[PDB]
Amino acid sequence: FFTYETPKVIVVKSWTIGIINRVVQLLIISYFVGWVFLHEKAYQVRDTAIESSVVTKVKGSGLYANRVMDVSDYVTPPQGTSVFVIITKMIVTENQMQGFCPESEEKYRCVSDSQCGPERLPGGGILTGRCVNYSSVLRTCEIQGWCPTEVDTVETPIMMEAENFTIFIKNSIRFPLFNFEKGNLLPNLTARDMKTCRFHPDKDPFCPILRVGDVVKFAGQDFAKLARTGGVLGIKIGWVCDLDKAWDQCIPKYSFTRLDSVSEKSSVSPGYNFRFAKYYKMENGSEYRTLLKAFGIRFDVLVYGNAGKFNIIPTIISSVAAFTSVGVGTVLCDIILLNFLKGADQYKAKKFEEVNE
Amino acid sequence: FFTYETPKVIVVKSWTIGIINRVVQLLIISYFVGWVFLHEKAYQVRDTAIESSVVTKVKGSGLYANRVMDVSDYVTPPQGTSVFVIITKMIVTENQMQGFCPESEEKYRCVSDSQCGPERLPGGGILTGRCVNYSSVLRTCEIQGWCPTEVDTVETPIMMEAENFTIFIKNSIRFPLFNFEKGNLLPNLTARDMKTCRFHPDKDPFCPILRVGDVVKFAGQDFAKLARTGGVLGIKIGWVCDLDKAWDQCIPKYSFTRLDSVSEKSSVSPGYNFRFAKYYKMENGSEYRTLLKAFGIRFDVLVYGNAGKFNIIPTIISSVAAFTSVGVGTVLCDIILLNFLKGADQYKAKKFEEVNE
Amino acid sequence: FFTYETPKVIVVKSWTIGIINRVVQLLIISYFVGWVFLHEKAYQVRDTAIESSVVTKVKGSGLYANRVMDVSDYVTPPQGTSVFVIITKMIVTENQMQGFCPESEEKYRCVSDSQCGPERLPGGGILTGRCVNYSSVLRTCEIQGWCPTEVDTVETPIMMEAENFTIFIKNSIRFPLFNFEKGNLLPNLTARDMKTCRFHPDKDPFCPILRVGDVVKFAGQDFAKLARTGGVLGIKIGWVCDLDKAWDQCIPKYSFTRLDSVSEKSSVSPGYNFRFAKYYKMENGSEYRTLLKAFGIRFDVLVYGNAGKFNIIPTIISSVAAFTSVGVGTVLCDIILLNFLKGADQYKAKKFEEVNE
Ligand SMILES: Nc1ncnc2c1ncn2[C@@H]1O[C@H](COP(=O)(O)OP(=O)(O)OP(=O)(O)O)[C@@H](O)[C@H]1O
Ligand SMILES: Nc1ncnc2c1ncn2[C@@H]1O[C@H](COP(=O)(O)OP(=O)(O)OP(=O)(O)O)[C@@H](O)[C@H]1O
Ligand SMILES: Nc1ncnc2c1ncn2[C@@H]1O[C@H](COP(=O)(O)OP(=O)(O)OP(=O)(O)O)[C@@H](O)[C@H]1O
Ligand SMILES: OC[C@H]1O[C@H](O[C@H]2[C@H](O)[C@@H](O)[C@@H](O)O[C@@H]2CO)[C@H](O)[C@@H](O)[C@@H]1O
Ligand SMILES: OC[C@H]1O[C@H](O[C@H]2[C@H](O)[C@@H](O)[C@@H](O)O[C@@H]2CO)[C@H](O)[C@@H](O)[C@@H]1O
Ligand SMILES: OC[C@H]1O[C@H](O[C@H]2[C@H](O)[C@@H](O)[C@@H](O)O[C@@H]2CO)[C@H](O)[C@@H](O)[C@@H]1O
Ligand SMILES: *[C@@H]1O[C@H](CO)[C@@H](O)[C@H](O)[C@H]1NC(C)=O
Ligand SMILES: *[C@@H]1O[C@H](CO)[C@@H](O)[C@H](O)[C@H]1NC(C)=O
Ligand SMILES: *[C@@H]1O[C@H](CO)[C@@H](O)[C@H](O)[C@H]1NC(C)=O
Ligand SMILES: *[C@@H]1O[C@H](CO)[C@@H](O)[C@H](O)[C@H]1NC(C)=O
Ligand SMILES: *[C@@H]1O[C@H](CO)[C@@H](O)[C@H](O)[C@H]1NC(C)=O
Ligand SMILES: *[C@@H]1O[C@H](CO)[C@@H](O)[C@H](O)[C@H]1NC(C)=O
Ligand SMILES: *[C@@H]1O[C@H](CO)[C@@H](O)[C@H](O)[C@H]1NC(C)=O
Ligand SMILES: *[C@@H]1O[C@H](CO)[C@@H](O)[C@H](O)[C@H]1NC(C)=O
Ligand SMILES: [Mg+2]
Ligand SMILES: [Mg+2]
Ligand SMILES: [Mg+2]
């Protein structure tokens, strides 16, 4: 039988419970309108899956080890990705060749060939088993490998000029849920701007060219100490865009920070360095290499974003849930009514029809 | 007191509101079955945290600078990860040596030694302060650095053969939530297929071998212009799988796009190139280098996914929400019944027991 | 009129339905405290958008091709990012120069110059169009390019010492929603620890030093086969932290797996290799190169996390959803009471006030 059910309802008219319920209903409606709808923007579909593309180019010259260094000297790797390192400090060990030689660290002090056993395996090459004089004051164990051994201890200068190098970022973003593409290079960017512009979070926040010193500062870092220890700085590019607004309002927000924080809270591993070698070989077949322990700043360009565009489906579902939530005040209103007018028994009686068996 | 409450209910038996409520209930149930259950598949848990592993290897040979280039020549970096560049154009500066030489851009045109001060610091090398004859017609400032300077301007030809190179992708995906592993190499892939296979959206859509010229076509790009300007193309691999279906139905979808979108929309930065150097030294200790400004296409293999497998918790909660939602039609049915039969007062009286105090 | 509505309610007092509904409600309340609050911890806000930074350094020395190899030889690329390879096997092609020579894979077999045409376009260099003796028993097609060609086929030994190398991971994590930073190097880590510590999932789970052999074992892989074929292992770093608990309890969880899983279930591409060349050039300007096919284990340092901390808003909304969901049992209790107490007719009459017109 096609029958429509619906509850039998009391309709109290006390001025007290009347205004207090109307106030609870007003607060519920305003909370859902201002928060769930305006702020949290539940009326639009959200896309967090951003497509990004970063192309970088470093520019500048520096003085180091009686050489003039250009980008190709101090940037590694060079293909211009969202991660690159700018070498600021280098410990060079020139012209290593395969042979036999003693270690240079005081950690390998010896007086007899009997001590040079399978105990200290890492570092350099393989122990030859002999104990050989490294200097007039020190004897260390002999190893086969790349000779002469590097000295890790003597500090070398840093390339101050790197502070004035320039990082150019080319970022292409696409939100697929809305098929919306934009880049951090607006159409009104000119060649003249590019040759001279200067990024600043306030004075020029759209200039694709970032001064390394500016970035180091923005992360609160001291160029001298950082270029001495090496480290990683993160350049974050945020694309929080409400596409219901104007197209030209989808705009990139720059952030700057230091990513390798653990290094400062450690006296044992304070920075970031890596070792690599330039390989040459003579007219004779023998090979030799220049071994460089490089200290520098690694840069990660981190591009995130989320875009929301209005659709009717989330709007409908949110309005349905809003109407279904306006009712929740009935329980609190029940408590107030049934326990705060002295004649509470009247309402308990009006509402409750007991049964027993 | 162990008491079970339940409300007193009117049960109208009007054929009109009876059928309109029964139809509203059918619409809610059908929307829940077709959309919530079938389409949005709320009966299964979704895992988006896919683990992916990409290994690439390029193949091909080409003529450039009267040389035959193989992979180790035009592929960079070489370790073959989900990112690589295939160089299509090279502006080469052979045999750079650290020394003194004049700049070559008209941007450094001068007549007096006073113009070359510490003002235009970046680029090339460091100004020595003199103004030196660069050619019979032009005078430019001198620099200390890698000599002679690179000339940026004369366009060089492109490696046409790059169009016919082959990109082999090896992709492994794993869903931990369901402990399901699968890869883009189907078990029915043979050595003979590999020896001849062919990626194509229709004729062979599983061949791990993709023609570069094909990929360029698939993003809607003209190979000539792309090899001239450089750019970034994204090869996307999708693993959208309904694990309730068959194991061999979890299949990867290839899509092709160009990621450096701003490049065509820019008159200032139209492509993707970078500069690097081959490092040599004579039998003499003297160092010299070959400088390459490389233009090529970057490939990032982008693997995303989400898999759904049935579990009892999502079905239980969806069915609970359905039963809690069947009641929603009553507000509409209340308004229609209580305000559109002239004797609405009968139902207001049957339903509403007013109160006053 | 500021009026408060509320429904009229039956209040059954049967002992049977009293305890059966109270038990349903007890099960609902206990499920909500134990599951939604204790287990799923809905009383706290979650952030999964973790910011992370990894810096790695490998150490060890090994014998290969009768040379001692250190970090600068076998780690690639070397900048110590979250991805690096420890080359374990090399197929070397010494002293290639630009020229004419026949192919070395049997795939190029010929007897007549008519077979080496523009038919088999890919591979090696450019077919010269002639057919030349590659061996006394075999003839292959001649190509223009780097000569003599590499042989892919002769099996080479592996670098056994690679098993005893050490990988040092330095991970910094940042939860921005709670602005909480920490690193996997606890402040009570000493130099002595670093010099002698030993990672083990049980005995010392915080020593940043991982033996490559240990990593191979934990991912359930045999060093010999991995090192012969090459592959990808994933080192995942997890930060599941309940900030409500102790601060020093935010601890990284290490897991080990092999990522290139398809390699083992496939007869086509069983491992991981790539090719690169050491570039030289003679006293004459002419270039020659040493070509290396590199087999190794790739390492991905994979850092995920989610942090949850108590907030008043999630607790409030969960308690609200709990109180609004306790009502759901009334439908089952309606069914039971109205159809399983013999006096069901009593309750049907007490509850339902029929109407007809
Ligand atoms: N680090 C940097 N500092 C300042 N300007 C830069 C930097 N990198 C690029 N630019 C400028 O941005 C513009 C576009 O960059 P892009 O490198 O794509 O062009 P390009 O002609 O290859 O540049 P160049 O010839 O200067 O290497 C160029 O005019 C270049 O001068
Ligand atoms: N692979 C490894 N195995 C064992 N210990 C390591 C390893 N890598 C680094 N360490 C230790 O941790 C510290 C980290 O040093 P870091 O790489 O930051 O600069 P470094 O002091 O120049 O390193 P090193 O002296 O080892 O070349 C080192 O002093 C070293 O003792
Ligand atoms: N870009 C490519 N184009 C065509 N075939 C390829 C490509 N990359 C790999 N292959 C083939 O796919 C298979 C998987 O390659 P893999 O590198 O694992 O084997 P390989 O023997 O080292 O290959 P190669 O013959 O290049 O040495 C090989 O048989 C190789 O011939
Ligand atoms: O709430 C977001 C919503 O977006 C999409 O829904 C589509 C639907 O899939 C299409 O068939 C279309 O007809 O209706 C909606 C229009 O936006 C997603 O498919 C869906 O998963 C999601 O709920
Ligand atoms: O193939 C074995 C598979 O059977 C079941 O899968 C069902 C699935 O649950 C349904 O949604 C249906 O439409 O498709 C399948 C039947 O072909 C279960 O998943 C399980 O028993 C098993 O994995
Ligand atoms: O999920 C967390 C939630 O945090 C933020 O909400 C804040 C709000 O911004 C503050 O004004 C604070 O007083 O109230 C909330 C605390 O939870 C974000 O606004 C919001 O997007 C985010 O969901
Ligand atoms: C940066 O450039 C300015 C002007 O060219 C100069 O005063 C300053 O010393 C430079 N910075 C460094 C670290 O050399
Ligand atoms: C380019 O136009 C945008 C549009 O609002 C504006 O923000 C920007 O200032 C313009 N560019 C310059 C260099 O002023
Ligand atoms: C190769 O010749 C060079 C001289 O060019 C010499 O120094 C070197 O020792 C020779 N190689 C060997 C293994 O002796
Ligand atoms: C690419 O291959 C086609 C046939 O596949 C051939 O006709 C064409 O000439 C090749 N392109 C180049 C630049 O050699
Ligand atoms: C391999 O299997 C897939 C589906 O598993 C099928 O589409 C494809 O055609 C098969 N390939 C061959 C060569 O049979
Ligand atoms: C590695 O060291 C262990 C113990 O230190 C030893 O059992 C093994 O022989 C060593 N292997 C190599 C290749 O050095
Ligand atoms: C350092 O502290 C951690 C946690 O507080 C502890 O697990 C570890 O045992 C401590 N280190 C040593 C060497 O005891
Ligand atoms: C370059 O010189 C080398 C010997 O140093 C010789 O083998 C080669 O044929 C020469 N090539 C040219 C083009 O001069
Ligand atoms: Mg040291
Ligand atoms: Mg230029
Ligand atoms: Mg081969």
Author numbering:
A (entry chain C), B (entry chain A), C (entry chain B): 7 to 363
Copy the relevant paper text:
We began by crystalizing the hP2X3 MFCslow construct in solutions containing ATP with either Mg2+ or Ca2+. We solved X-ray structures of the receptor with Mg2+-ATP or Ca2+-ATP bound at resolutions of 3.8 Å and 3.3 Å, respectively. The pores appear to be in an open-like conformation in both structures, similar to that observed in the structure of hP2X3 bound to free-ATP. Importantly, we observed strong residual electron densities around the ATP binding site in these structures. Considering that the crystallization conditions included either 50 mM Mg-acetate or 50 mM Ca-acetate with no other divalent cations, and that the electron densities are surrounded by acidic residues, we interpreted the densities as Mg2+ and Ca2+ ions, respectively. In both structures, the divalent ions are detected at the edge of the ATP binding pocket, simultaneously interacting with D158 on the receptor and with the γ-phosphate of ATP; E156 is also positioned nearby and appears to be involved in coordinating the ion. Conversely, in our ATP-bound structure, with Mg2+ directly coordinated by the ATP γ-phosphate and D158, the ion is ~9 Å away from the side chain of E109. The key residue involved in both binding modes is D158, whose side chain points towards E109 for the upper mode or towards the γ-phosphate of ATP for the lower mode. That the Mg2+-ATP complex observed in our structures adopts a rare configuration suggests that interactions between the receptor and divalent ions have a dominant effect in determining the structure and stability of the complex. In the presence of ATP and Mg2+, the simulation data (obtained with a conventional algorithm) is highly consistent with our crystal structures, showing stable close-range interactions between Mg2+ and both the ATP γ-phosphate and D158.
